[PDB]
Design a protein that fits this description.
The structure is a homodimer.
Chain A (H helix, E strand, L loop, with lengths): L1 E6 L5 H10 L4 E5 L5 H4 L3 E6 L16 H4 L9 E4 L1 H9 L3 E17 L18 H4 L17 E14 L5 E6 L2 E8 L4 E4 L11 H9 L15 H8 L7 E6 L3 H4 L2 H7 L4 E6 L8 H12 L4 E5 L2 H8 L5 H20 L9 E4 L4 H8 L17 E3 L7 H10 L5 H4 L18 H20 L8 E6 L4 E12 L2 E4 L4 H14 L3 E7 L12
Parallel strand pairs in A: 1-2, 1-3, 3-4, 4-9, 10-11, 10-13, 11-12, 13-14, 16-18
Antiparallel strand pairs in A: 5-6, 5-7, 7-8, 8-9, 15-16, 16-17
The structure holds glutamine (2 copies).
């Protein structure tokens, strides 16, 4: 089952192939000007159209023959157009493509469209209501996007021309802030179209859309099941389990606690657990995180650090978020090294274990904004060990269940690097932290009691013997650069605010953030 | 139909009579030790028990005979106990009254109880859940409180002993923060009990509960209908319509615009309208308020003032709310006098028209907190003219409809004295006002568009080319010292926040206040 791929001049053409090789599907390359005789004798159950530096309507521009396109639809050959490829599918099928209003380059989020998802569009006036615009186009109920987490997906943009008129009898599937008709799907001829480049590493769900295309749509008979795994990288390092050591910043997050779980199984004695209580943690996490780790991992060597006093004194006076982040970052590297320099081992023979995920890499790769980022800490040059570099968050959740670990660790909302520092606005103090912790803990303990925690991506509190003002944050994260605010039922919401202003001393006003990202952010500072 | 009133030593006993005389019901006085023979020959269709400096259970304390109480219930004579009077009704009917945990003195709000109203109680742990406590007592569906605006009512407290055990087969009707079983009602014997003193001027709904008691419960045949009126005071001043003049601070509020409407009819030429644009007003109120007034009152002499520049320069640097209020107040008296000193008339022969209401007097009388107060401005000694001194807000709404005035003026939320000054936190600027006005106007224009404005007591925005944070305020006011926060439907709420962060330049975050009063307030500063 060879899937045919055609080149139009895309600088990402090899990535299109490399994607197929990672998902272990056979592939054969031909250009955009192949005579039918060369692809008729071959068994082909799919077609892919690449991008190209040319304009889809200008003179001398690369295209396909008229009779070769009428060869696919009759033989039931699913088509897939990328960027310039999508534009080619439009032009040949009575669709109009002209120069766009504004170009698109870099990381970009696109909205999957149902008749339900239409409400999630804010940019209606960019090209002026929600349904007032999508009444001109078709929709449906969700097949390319089978098994996708959210209705958003981060993709790689590189183009200046977009589609202007949807081809004959097509469904509009996706839209972006600067490209309305971004993705299409013909149910009749089983054709898919996309303006972005899913093959690019920056595109998060690129391999997922390819797996659904060739397997679940083109019906290729697999023949290659295992392939890429979290254990493949682990089975590799097994050949170093006596030569070197492995250290890890035990933070308490699911990413660090289930990465250390396997790396302790390999380096049973050569593994060092380093947990640092910066004093910027939540209520009782100074002990509960440590106590839990020692209990669940008895054989694991754990070194607990209390540099909280070194964090407070160094943050005194500092009110600017950037310098507050700069201090915490440049101080975390110190207390970590100092801890490593308490356990005498070969520095040139040791690994740096970092539960790093595929989305974490791109979030750092595609430099957009790093205020809401979680993995912050990502004079000693280590050989970095990131076995989950090609893995997802939902994946890690599955492994943590296989290890008989509780659900408490897999439901735990992602707690960022700088901690409560960017949650205490202005001057930071040990007193303000105490007040914020009392408020934050009540807020969380209730969300658990009434069962809303699991339905929220991330929830916390912000502080704005003086009486202070508190803000309650609760979001529904779709991508690392876009999120909504969770709509807490009022009856439940009322109880929390009632139980905070009554019990906690030092607060007389509670606010709830009702601003989305963009243009806002998850974290205040 | 004489209503019997009994004295126990209350210092407010005459007020109990004075209330009856205002509602024009016949009354006859006897003490707490009347022999039955004196009240049997008299036609009595009601009974009232007053307070007293004594304790209801101590030795030598004033009480009633056992056979005189068994005289009412058989002859169908409705009873009404006040403070010590209520405590007497309890003791004689197998109810227990002991010294309270904490005393109560001054203005106090009490909660009317249904099975619905139980959720409005926050002080459950003062004597620990909502229904967990009121499951021991009885409730019902709302007769003493016929035609009452809210489920709260401001009353006058003076006592140290409260009831501890509800008398045989009684309904619990009201509760306070320091007195659980505050008001009772026996459906069997038609008996009512109250810990507070409704006869006191400070008690807002004192005359209302008396009108329902004697008329709607005791069935007295009226014989006196007109009595107190808004026109009685107006018909009085008619004897000065040539001797003196009348000036009024035209603000734009319903209280000033429908008070000037009548006073212009009397002093057709001797009346002066003074509207001051302090620059702290809402969007376009600098002209819309003036233009409306001149149009609806063509014959009325109106003097428009633009002291906005005198308000800004004087408020520069001032960030403390108290001094911000102190400046505005001490400056409003200046621009008003200066305006009066532009119209040469006899200063010793002029009236000061002030649309003042009965609740406004008590709000100032019972000095609790004046941050949320509306009537703020309440070297020239005038003869004050307050014809609505004994009138309610709901009353004024009825008169403004009789004058064929639009609903726009009767739905207009009460806009306070200091204006947008206490809504711009910190340094005040002409720039910040522009940004706040754009946000506030959008917020209001939407509440009108989606029809929530009328269901809200008061709604506005607060600001916290720099990007600033905005807070949206929307409350359900029950009393001038207690209020909830309105629960805006999310779909509607989402649109507003979406339309502010997109259209308004200078804001990147929107918050919504979810704190009630107490312990918070309506206004930030
Ligand atoms: N990457 C691309 O395909 C961009 C090519 C060309 N600029 C276009 O408008 O499509
Ligand atoms: N005003 C009153 O009736 C108070 C009297 C007395 N102190 C009591 O506890 O009732």
């Amino acid at each position: 089952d060879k899937i045919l791929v055609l080149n139009f001049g895309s600088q990402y053409f090899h990535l299109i192939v490399k994607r197929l090789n990672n998902i272990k599907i056979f592939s054969e390359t031909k250009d955009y000007g192949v005579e039918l005789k060369d692809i008729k004798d071959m068994n082909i159950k799919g077609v892919i159209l690449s991008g190209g530096p040319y304009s889809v309507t200008e003179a001398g521009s690369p295209h396909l023959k008229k009779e070769v396109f009428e060869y696919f639809l009759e033989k039931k050959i699913p088509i897939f157009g990328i960027a310039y490829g999508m534009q080619e599918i439009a032009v040949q099928m009575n669709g109009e493509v002209k120069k766009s209003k504004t170009s698109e380059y870099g990381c970009t989020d696109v909205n999957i469209l149902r008749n339900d998802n239409i409400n999630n569009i804010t940019y209606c006036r960019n090209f002026s209501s929600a349904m007032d615009l999508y009444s001109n186009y078709k929709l449906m109920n969700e097949c390319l996007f089978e098994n996708i987490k959210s209705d958003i997906t981060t993709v790689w943009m590189n183009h200046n021309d977009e589609v202007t008129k949807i081809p004959e009898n097509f469904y509009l599937v996706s839209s972006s802030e600067n490209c309305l008709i971004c993705s299409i799907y013909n149910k009749e001829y089983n054709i898919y179209g996309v303006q972005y480049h899913p093959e690019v590493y920056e595109s998060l769900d690129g391999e997922l859309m390819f797996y659904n295309f060739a397997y679940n749509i083109c019906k290729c008979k697999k023949q290659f099941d295992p392939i890429r795994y979290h254990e493949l990288e682990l089975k590799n390092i097994e050949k170093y389990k006596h030569d070197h050591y492995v250290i890890a910043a035990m933070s308490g997050g699911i990413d660090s606690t289930v990465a250390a779980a396997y790396t302790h199984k390999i380096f049973k004695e050569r593994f060092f657990g380093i947990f640092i209580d910066n004093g910027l943690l939540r209520k009782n996490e100074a002990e509960n995180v440590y106590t839990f780790l020692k209990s669940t991992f008895p054989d694991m060597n754990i070194t607990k650090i209390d540099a909280s006093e070194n964090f407070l004194s160094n943050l005194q006076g500092v009110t600017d978020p950037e310098q507050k982040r700069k201090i915490i970052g440049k101080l975390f590297i110190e207390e970590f090294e100092k801890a490593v320099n308490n356990i005498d081992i070969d520095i040139n023979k040791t690994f740096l274990l970092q539960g790093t995920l595929y989305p974490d890499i791109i979030e750092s790769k595609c430099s957009k904004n790093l205020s809401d980022t979680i993995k912050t800490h990502h004079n000693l040059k280590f050989k970095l060990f990131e076995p989950f570099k090609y893995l997802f968050k939902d994946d890690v959740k599955t492994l943590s269940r296989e290890l008989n670990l509780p659900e408490e660790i897999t439901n735990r909302h992602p707690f960022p690097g700088p901690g409560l520092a960017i949650r205490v606005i202005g001057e930071i103090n040990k007193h303000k932290l105490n007040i914020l912790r009392e408020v934050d803990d009540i807020f969380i303990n209730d969300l658990k009691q009434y069962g809303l925690y699991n339905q929220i991506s991330q929830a916390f509190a912000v502080l704005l013997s003086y009486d202070y003002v508190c803000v309650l944050r609760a979001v529904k994260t779709s991508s690392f650069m876009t999120a909504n605010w969770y709509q807490i039922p009022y009856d439940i919401l009322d109880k929390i605010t009632t139980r905070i202003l009554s019990e906690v001393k030092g607060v007389n006003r509670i606010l709830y953030d009702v601003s989305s990202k963009p243009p806002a952010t998850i974290e205040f500072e």
